[PDB]
Design a binder for these strands. Structure first.
Ligand SMILES: [Zn+2]
Ligand SMILES: [Zn+2]
Lengths: 424, 522, 424, 485
RNA sequence: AGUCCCGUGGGGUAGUGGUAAUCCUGCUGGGCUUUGGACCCGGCGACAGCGGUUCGACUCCGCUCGGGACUACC
RNA sequence: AGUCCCGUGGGGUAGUGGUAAUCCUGCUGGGCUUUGGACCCGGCGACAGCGGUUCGACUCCGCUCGGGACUA
């Protein structure tokens, strides 16, 4: 994907990537393989991979190539059945040390090649449903995944592990929680560290998710490192996890709850003792979701207009991420009321993340309640958002949506708040 | 010793720390610390079938971290930050000082390294210069490459639960300078190593212990490549080369004799224990079990001095010492060691050995002595072939000693985390036309323009204070006094700190001699 | 403020709040003081305060009322002077048990009455600049405060304590950090528990803040409970604090840093050791602020339209709260670029809160970087937002603004991230 | 003792635990826990001296990660009113013929006691103007409240008292009655009645469960509350015995004035007077002090109440601060001490033959703080009877505890919304009240052939709702009893 | 190679940048030896060597000759 | 008010839903007491009271009353 002067310079000699070439400059002369050049990067330079192994960038303004060679393009039973689904997350791979380029790999075989330990845990089945970077993920794909998991689980699978990207993983798990009802475990995972790295947390994450996919915990969950150490993983209940760090292996924490368990490639520790057992539920799939849902974080200065523009744009629902306890500027009242007159649900959650909303304590809150706002108890903001999308895809009766929001359905709301839910 | 006739080909690989404020791909300081680690992180690196159970176990590492002296970068908990400019600048200068051709675009890479010294399973390295050269009496020597890489974490302990590295050194800037692999003249190798050193000392570089590292690679026609690590003293390079040439020649003569008599190496280990029921050597009598192996026709050659002081058997002894064991006993040196002939004849007999071959025994616990003898057989087999490629270390004298095999070809791919660095020619000149003066130049210049005696100027440069410096007084206070303070004080407080002030108050009240007490308080 | 029916027949008898009355009904008969009835509540009932002390509601549809009675410090020097300003936060009060209603109180003496201990810490001066509920806080008031403090500190005050509301405290402190340069401490504070309560944190918080206000640490900060225990307080660096819990006493936590100190009504313990000392600074005040800055939290499904709407509305800047590491959907690229084509700065921060952004690691990040987004290192989203407001209030040169965002002005950005920064 | 003439005013204050799934304004379960608490919260309540009062407000609360939540800790706002609680609260109300409020409002009863973590108690009136019938006439029930029980103490250290938050929040119903009864026999009748009704609804059964406190009044006497009167059949006696104690003290005051008695806080170290004594108690006592009470002679030993004397009260006030029992003039001629000694103390303390002495044989440090109390009470004797809070003894007598509770200052608990009692859902009980135990007994018998004893036990054990009949019962009322064996 | 210690009359033993070196031992003049010694006056004889700093260097800095301790692939 | 034990010949001490109770000791018949003690064969004499449950309850359940322990 070279551009401008570069490509022009590189084409005028009929040279492509992979081609062993020889470049001559007034004071230098390199000999290496041409490498594709990232688009972000700008022309004038040609990436060459010298014989010693190092990639180099050379200014062509006064170069002179000469091709020297064209490219080249060379089930024991007695063990549970577990399907490893890839949504776009890569939890294992292989590198071509002849290009410097890393290449994904999501196959029942490849995974095994990289994680032999798996063979003693369960019988792997790992196709790759689809592929979207965790960042570019949207409501539509929540469904597409729920549908994808529903399949594997319907085709005789004792557990399903979804290889999702970190960034949005928690949003997705939320979705799958509301849209899926399961007799078997569905554990989401990924790596904070690219799988191509020898240090990647992918390995422990995967064979711990596989381990969990075996457990008696049959809910949609998230399984990641419990610390920076390569020892354990925490099994987080799907509607109560949140990526709390931008890089740390232990980025995922349970929010208004404690980890449901403590996994290892060898076993589980089930810390939480109240959860959906295995068989207990029957595979149902509510794949209906309303793609259109506002999710507005409140803040000093926010304008009612933003709320309005949303109503005008035909937004069926609004999830506000208020200030501690469930607030938002009084100037928003009118608008929020208007949303009600328009039969548009408006729910409130707190930016604080840690906590239970109580719009009864202060006036600002009560008037907000007076305007039809729906307190969401202690439901994490992004979950309340994910839920509205689901609920407003289950009905169009404002009144009912308000009921279903407050309705604990998968574990999004916890009646009481333990002192143990806010370490630091 | 007719170097060009034995086909001697030498090479030099020098690594130098930089002494930049911040590390290379992170902001942490570039100094080590003795303080107690704030956090111990347990990790496991990963390979790439019956060993993916034993290999793994050897990849468990504990990393010591500091809440201050370390960040998430060293821990592989936060992506590397962009290339440290200050580093690249010194790297470039150094390169230019070597007449190298600085690259148009700097690209960081990942040299595959599952050694444990790197927290990510790789080392970040990048090529900065190439095709350079030096000038020596012996002729012009070319300097092949110049790279900027992170130094590795350092080892602290080894326990049942694997190795323990400290992250303080992890990340400190380094420049790998490689020279032509075919030198040919020992005296020439020392000349290059020296000049390089003097050039490095011409730039912002760390001075002290761990600081530099020089590894020569000796070779000989029909011999083999051997890397000699850590040759602190350059004056001794000639000597260790010559002595290495002898060892490979001796090993070669030994190859030809093993063939003269078509020697054979049988991996058959014998439990020669009953042969010593009643022995006269505590070493064995107190030894758990005892095994031995025969090497056909090897007689008279395991004890031949291949190098002034050490014998082939020593090599074998070193190959076998790994896996645990004191030191192997063998036919050509076993007539003694507190064992009589009647016993010597007893071993030869029980092992079924002719009078033309020899035996190598190991008095230890059966489980390991078996693993140890398996090695002395491995080396024995190598003797049949000749000189084997290995990594050795230099001893006090000119000899060397086996350490481990030779480094495997360096597999390496792109470090996508760090951006590319374009080296605008404009700023490249603002350097090439302002390269630093060598130490020698500093000394004379400073002498010639301050009346400093050779001695005072020599020291002032030796101690890197020329930049700081009655003149003969201001110098005699940083070249003489401040060194005396490293015996009764902590002068490592702030050069230009108290100095600035105090140096002034010598122009008014405060006799010359008061200094070595005033500042001291500080 | 009764309404409809209630007022109707509460009027038709000429009775007001406070009047002792006697209500009679077919099956009951009460005698108490009429009390004001919150607006949220619907009519039909009248709040009476029986003789026993208990307030009760009585349906008047068949009532009948009858009025029974109409309504009805030192300055010993040798002690630092500290100004306690109140922006709307109430950290001390008095209750009139004759009405059941609690009413604020922010006087150099009222505080003294409720916090005598102060008398030995410093000489209190406590005006009440203005009054706005922390929920309803806006950029204009950040300034008004910025101005207010500058005053006291100019009229000779060794320290200044601002009694702010919890909800948005961290936003404001962030603001005063950028707007003010100080020779003395400026510590914000408040209570999670109403001051009217005997258990309110207001007490320890106020007399720790004042303590702090005397300390050598001279930068804008937040001093609050360090645990649920009533023993210590942490002094948080303003541009690095966040209201992390909905109600807990220890809601405020330092984010990408550790607390600057350990405060007690008796002393401070200064944990951090690198801070702006006392005199070192000269009182400056850049009170200019661009009140219009978009602060959009990214999420699965967010549509370009919101970003455009913002550009169209004439928003001079945008701060995105992206997914870990600093991402946002590929689909917003074009819009983000267009924003650049319009000279509108766009900054990226992560929802994770904890952590440092690195838009170089992944493609999405690079591409976003290619569209001109400004990565904000590890600066909290809300401070990057508060910061944009200030910066676009100091210039209109887009490039200049990108340079200012990235510039650590008051400690908003930390070059390195220590392991000690992510406990759990 | 013709009550109507002495001007006796009696009042009953009963508090009942409700036994609902979750607590009042929290979800936490309604049973205590003996397990080790997972978290000790340190707190300080605040007045509104401010150096020694404060120190008496330092409190450490024991929390549980599971059997406790943030509401108990005062770290999370009160959830709304527990419906089930208000249900039983109303049921009981209706059963007492009270008028259920139209709108329920939760209040904050100022309570700087430590028993609650907030500095107040959440209470709300549910009904009023109720009434019951006793042979002696119709008795009125003033108010019925639904409040949260307080936290229970566990330890007292140098760093203050320690409460456990498990009992805090358990739903309570405070039932009050006219504070002017006049007929002790009648009070027992209402106490009983109330008991049977409370026992007719979903209510806690057991130890700490019920708590009855009656207040005895005497014309020209004083207000005094009797705390924890376990046995109801014993009410009339403790009342009678109280009235006796009031009248008795209305005389000890007038005598003290008749002789213008004076209380001197002068403590003497009358130790050398017992260098060689004939009483182990003192000879083995570290030091020994004594105090003089002018003109107090002959009245410290006067039996104010059947069995106990003023000196006993004094012994009571003195008991605190540690000490076995005070020795005094009017009872000291004996106790293993000769008059040669009795005359020795009177002399050493410089006491006329008209006044008396009160001595304390213990360690100097405390005996001093003990005697300062006997003085405090002595001075009160001059004034008379004080309104005070006392407890009931094994027999009918009582004992000093602490002053009379302060006027209950209280404002509105704004965190909890109002509750309108749907007139429509109110009759949905009004005409479905529960049968009293008495009625359960008979009914079961009547329709199950169960003998009186069997039906009795079944009801007594509340297994009626559970239950060849005679067997289904005999293994719920008889064998399941052997179960707890 | 790095850090570092020691090198004082003939024998041992202290201690020190200064107008310069401690006793025992050796050797020698006298006194007292009622022509031993002991004791008392007094003599002889050292700072390892070259530089640099210094007003002056065994004494601070460096290099040698001499002995040594310690560390010398990660 | 609580919960847990005990409440057995005159006194003591074991033992028990069943065709119901131990020896010690007191009292008293006979013998021997080589005509006192005392030993030796025996006799009189109990399982607190009212219920329920039971084919039959002291021993199961409750309740009176009495002795004992602990808990608030
Ligand atoms: Zn670092
Ligand atoms: Zn609770």
């Amino acid at each position: 994907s070279y551009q401008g002067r570069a490509r022009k310079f590189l084409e005028s000699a009929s040279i492509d990537v992979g081609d062993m070439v020889l470049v001559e400059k007034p004071d230098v002369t390199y000999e290496g393989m041409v490498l594709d050049r990232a688009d972000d990067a700008d022309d004038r330079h040609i990436v060459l991979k010298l014989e010693n192994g190092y990639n180099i960038g050379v200014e062509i303004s006064d170069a002179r190539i000469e091709l020297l060679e064209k490219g080249s393009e060379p089930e024991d039973p007695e063990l549970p059945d577990v399907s490893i689904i890839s949504t776009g997350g890569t939890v294992a791979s292989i590198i071509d040390y002849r290009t410097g380029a890393v290449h994904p790999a999501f196959t029942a075989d490849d995974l095994l090649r990289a994680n032999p330990e798996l063979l003693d845990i369960a019988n792997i089945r790992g196709r790759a449903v689809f592929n979207i970077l965790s960042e570019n993920m949207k409501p539509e794909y929540w469904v597409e995944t729920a549908r994808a998991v529903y399949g594997e689980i319907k085709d005789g699978a004792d557990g399903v592990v979804v290889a999702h990207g970190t960034d949005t993983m928690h949003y997705t798990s939320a979705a799958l929680s509301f849209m899926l009802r399961t007799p078997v475990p569905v554990v989401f995972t990924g790596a904070q560290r690219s799988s191509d790295r020898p240090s990647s947390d992918a390995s422990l994450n995967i064979q711990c998710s596989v381990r969990a996919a075996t457990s008696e915990i049959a809910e949609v969950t998230v399984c990641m490192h419990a610390t920076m150490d390569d020892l354990s993983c925490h099994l987080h209940r799907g509607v109560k996890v949140r990526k709390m760090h931008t890089s740390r292996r232990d980025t995922f924490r349970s929010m208004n709850a404690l980890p449901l368990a403590e996994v290892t490639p060898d076993g589980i520790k089930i810390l939480e003792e109240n959860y959906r057992k295995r068989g207990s539920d029957e595979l149902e799939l509510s794949d209906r979701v309303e793609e259109r849902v506002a999710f507005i974080k409140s803040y000093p200065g926010i304008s009612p207009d933003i709320i309005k523009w949303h109503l005008d744009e035909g937004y069926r629902g609004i999830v506000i991420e208020g200030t501690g306890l469930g607030h938002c500027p009084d100037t928003l009242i009118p608008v929020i009321g208007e949303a009600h007159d328009m039969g548009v649900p408006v729910a409130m959650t707190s930016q604080c993340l840690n906590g239970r909303v109580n719009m009864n304590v202060y006036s600002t809150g009560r008037r907000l309640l007076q305007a039809g706002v729906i307190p969401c108890d202690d439901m994490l903001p992004e979950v309340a958002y994910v839920k509205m999308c689901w609920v407003l895809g289950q009905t169009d009766d404002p009144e009912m949506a308000r009921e279903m929001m407050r309705e604990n359905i998968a574990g999004e709301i916890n009646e009481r708040t333990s002192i143990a839910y806010f370490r630091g | 010793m007719d170097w060009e006739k034995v086909g001697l080909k030498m090479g030099l690989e020098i690594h130098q720390q930089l002494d930049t404020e911040s590390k290379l791909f992170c902001p942490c300081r570039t100094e080590l610390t003795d303080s107690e680690p704030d956090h111990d992180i347990v990790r496991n690196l990963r390979p790439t079938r019956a060993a993916f159970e034993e290999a793994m176990r050897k990849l468990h590492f504990h990393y010591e971290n500091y809440h201050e002296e370390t960040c998430l970068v060293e821990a592989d908990e936060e992506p590397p930050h962009p290339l440290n400019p200050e580093a690249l600048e010194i790297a470039v200068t150094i390169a230019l000082l070597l007449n190298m051709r600085v690259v148009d675009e700097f690209h960081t890479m990942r040299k595959q390294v599952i050694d444990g010294s790197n927290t990510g399973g790789f080392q970040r390295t990048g090529l900065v210069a190439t095709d350079g050269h030096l000038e020596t009496p012996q002729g012009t020597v070319k300097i092949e490459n110049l790279c900027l890489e992170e130094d590795a974490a350092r080892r602290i302990r080894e326990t049942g639960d694997g190795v323990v590295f400290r992250l303080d050194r992890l990340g400190i800037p380094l420049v790998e300078i490689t020279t032509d692999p075919s030198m040919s003249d020992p005296q020439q190798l020392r000349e290059v190593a020296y000049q390089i050193g003097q050039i490095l000392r011409s730039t912002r570089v760390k001075r002290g212990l761990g600081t530099i590292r020089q590894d020569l690679n000796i070779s000989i026609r029909d011999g083999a490549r051997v890397e000699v690590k850590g040759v602190q003293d350059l004056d001794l390079i000639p000597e260790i080369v010559e002595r290495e040439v002898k060892r490979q020649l001796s090993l070669v003569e030994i190859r030809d004799t093993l063939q003269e008599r078509g020697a054979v190496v049988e991996d058959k280990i014998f439990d020669v224990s009953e042969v010593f029921a009643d022995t006269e050597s505590r070493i064995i009598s107190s030894a758990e079990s005892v095994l031995a192996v025969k090497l056909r026709g090897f007689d008279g050659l395991i004890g031949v001095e291949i190098q002034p002081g050490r014998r082939l058997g020593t090599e074998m002894a070193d190959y076998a010492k790994k896996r645990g064991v004191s030191g192997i006993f063998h036919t050509d040196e076993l007539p003694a060691y507190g064992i009589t002939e009647e016993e010597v004849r007893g071993l030869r007999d029980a092992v079924g050995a002719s009078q033309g071959d020899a035996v190598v025994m190991v008095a230890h616990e059966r489980v390991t002595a078996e693993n140890a003898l398996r090695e002395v057989i491995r080396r024995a087999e190598m003797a049949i072939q000749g000189v084997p490629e290995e990594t050795r270390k230099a001893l006090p004298d000119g000899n060397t000693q086996y350490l481990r095999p030779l480094p495997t070809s360096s597999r390496m791919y792109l470090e996508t985390d760090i951006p590319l660095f374009r080296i605008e020619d404009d700023l490249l000149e603002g350097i090439r036309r302002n390269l630093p003066e060598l130490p020698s130049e500093k000394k004379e210049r400073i002498m010639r323009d301050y009346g400093l005696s050779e001695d005072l100027a020599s020291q002032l440069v030796k101690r890197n204070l020329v930049d700081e410096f009655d003149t003969t007084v201001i110098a005699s206070l940083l070249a003489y006094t401040l060194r005396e303070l490293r015996r009764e004080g902590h002068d490592v407080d702030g050069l230009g700190l108290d100095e600035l002030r105090d140096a002034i108050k010598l122009l008014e009240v405060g006799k010359i001699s008061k200094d070595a007490l005033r500042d001291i308080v500080a």
